[PDB]
Amino acid sequence: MKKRLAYAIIQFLHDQLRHGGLSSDAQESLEVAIQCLETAFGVTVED
Amino acid sequence: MKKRLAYAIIQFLHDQLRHGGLSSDAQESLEVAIQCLETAFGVTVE
């Protein structure tokens, strides 16, 4: 599995969640996606 | 451009779903993430 690519994707999504100009519904979807990606790939982004 | 990157990411995640050497459980989690991203970014890949 490509954990380092997954990590970078999670970084991008965290950024979109806060700064992407998405609707509140889209943000909710991204939050679940991030949790699911963290679980699937066994990574979380460092502080 | 953020949609275009989102699109590239969705394609990559679809590829990982099949090719990424995930457990059955991890693959389910990835499936949920893919649905969520497709919904959030308004792009769906078959």
UniProtKB/Swiss-Prot annotation, chain A:
Q: How is expression of this protein distributed across tissues?
A: Ubiquitous.
Q: How does it assemble?
A: Homodimer. Homooligomer. Interacts with DNAJC5 and DNAJC5B. Interacts (via TPR repeats) with HSP90AA1. Interacts (via Gln-rich region) with SLC2A1. Interacts with HSP90AB1. Interacts (via TPR repeats) with HSPA8/Hsc70; the interaction is direct. Interacts with BAG6 (via ubiquitin-like domain); interaction prevents interaction between BAG6 and RNF126. Forms a multiprotein complex, at least composed of DNAJB12, DNAJB14, HSPA8/Hsc70 and SGTA; interaction with DNAJB14 and HSPA8/Hsc70 is direct.
The identity of this protein, by name, is Small glutamine-rich tetratricopeptide repeat-containing protein alpha
According to its record, what is known about the domains?
Answer: The second tetratricopeptide repeat (TPR 2) mediates the interaction with SARS-CoV accessory protein 7a.
What is known about what this protein does? Co-chaperone that binds misfolded and hydrophobic patches-containing client proteins in the cytosol. Mediates their targeting to the endoplasmic reticulum but also regulates their sorting to the proteasome when targeting fails. Functions in tail-anchored/type II transmembrane proteins membrane insertion constituting with ASNA1 and the BAG6 complex a targeting module. Functions upstream of the BAG6 complex and ASNA1, binding more rapidly the transmembrane domain of newly synthesized proteins. (Microbial infection) In case of infection by polyomavirus, involved in the virus endoplasmic reticulum membrane penetration and infection via interaction with DNAJB12, DNAJB14 and HSPA8/Hsc70.
Subcellular location(s) per record: Cytoplasm; Nucleus
**Domain of life of the source:** Eukaryota
Q: Which family does it belong to?
A: Belongs to the SGT family.
* Position of the signal peptide: none
Q: What is the lineage of its organism?
A: Eukaryota, Metazoa, Chordata, Craniata, Vertebrata
Give the originating organism.
Homo sapiens
Name of the coding gene: SGTA
